[PDB]
């Protein structure tokens, strides 16, 4: 995607917030933006923490959430005004109430405008609300898994990606990443114990999408094969896109 160096961009740390909800999204020399989020069903609550790293107040501090056109239809975000004056060394919080209307690919933009020393300060960063946040894990027995796997009918509902590892292929980190992504992590389904299997339901207002995945590490080749099978083509695509970036 988007060409050129991802440093000083709107998305430097986005990928660190797909399989976890808490941490520092952005930090320049004036402002730190932290996150803490929780999701249930098709809903979420995201706390955004604005930290003034300086010894002077920020004035007219105004964070705004922007959702590009298709995103508008698929994601509803509700929030309340933040106090515009932020003391040096202080933090102010914003709470963002999230409702997923239907599956979606784009991310909202958080724009922050404030005055510091009489100067106009402007920051834009992509906010890590991603489709996998709306997962319900679904534990099930291996027989039930394979019966559902083999109900795929529409070829477009199956998406596979064979890709080079970007990170060390550590077993326990991999387990943690799948659990953080949000599906159940099913053991004793793939007879090869080195592979990972997941199952869950993506919840949206209008549609519930059942999802099955398989991750096959190839340690000597430093490669993975990821397979998504779900009840909606666009969900298989976005989940494969997201998960692939994590390994």
């Amino acid at each position: 995607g988007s060409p050129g160096i991802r440093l000083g961009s709107s998305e430097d740390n986005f990928a660190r917030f797909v399989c976890k909800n808490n941490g520092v999204l952005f930090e320049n020399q004036l402002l730190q933006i932290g996150l803490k989020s929780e999701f249930r069903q098709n809903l979420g609550r995201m706390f955004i923490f604005y930290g003034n790293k300086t010894s002077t107040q920020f004035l007219n501090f105004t964070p705004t959430l922007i959702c590009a056109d298709d995103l508008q239809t698929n994601l509803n975000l509700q929030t309340k005004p933040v106090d515009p004056t932020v003391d040096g060394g202080a933090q102010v919080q914003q709470v963002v109430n999230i409702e997923c209307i239907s599956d979606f690919t784009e991310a909202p933009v958080l724009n922050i405008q404030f005055r510091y020393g009489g100067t106009f300060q402007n920051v834009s960063v992509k906010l890590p609300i991603t489709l996998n946040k709306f997962f319900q894990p679904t534990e099930m027995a291996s027989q039930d898994f394979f019966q559902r796997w083999k109900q795929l009918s529409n070829p477009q509902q199956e998406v596979q990606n064979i890709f080079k590892a970007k990170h060390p292929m550590d077993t326990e980190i991999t387990k943690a990443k799948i659990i953080g992504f949000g599906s159940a992590l099913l053991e004793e389904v793939d007879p090869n114990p080195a592979n990972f299997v997941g199952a869950g339901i993506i919840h949206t207002k209008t549609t519930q999408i059942g999802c099955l995945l398989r991750l096959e590490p190839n340690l000597q080749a430093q490669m993975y094969r990821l397979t998504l099978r779900t009840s909606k083509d666009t969900v298989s695509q976005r989940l494969c896109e997201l998960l692939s970036e994590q390994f």
């Binding site: 291996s142 394979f146 796997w149 083999k150 389904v189 793939d190 007879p191 398989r214």
Partner: peptide, 5 residues
């Protein structure tokens, strides 16, 4: 053999 076909 392979339950995934």
């Amino acid at each position: 053999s392979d339950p995934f076909k």
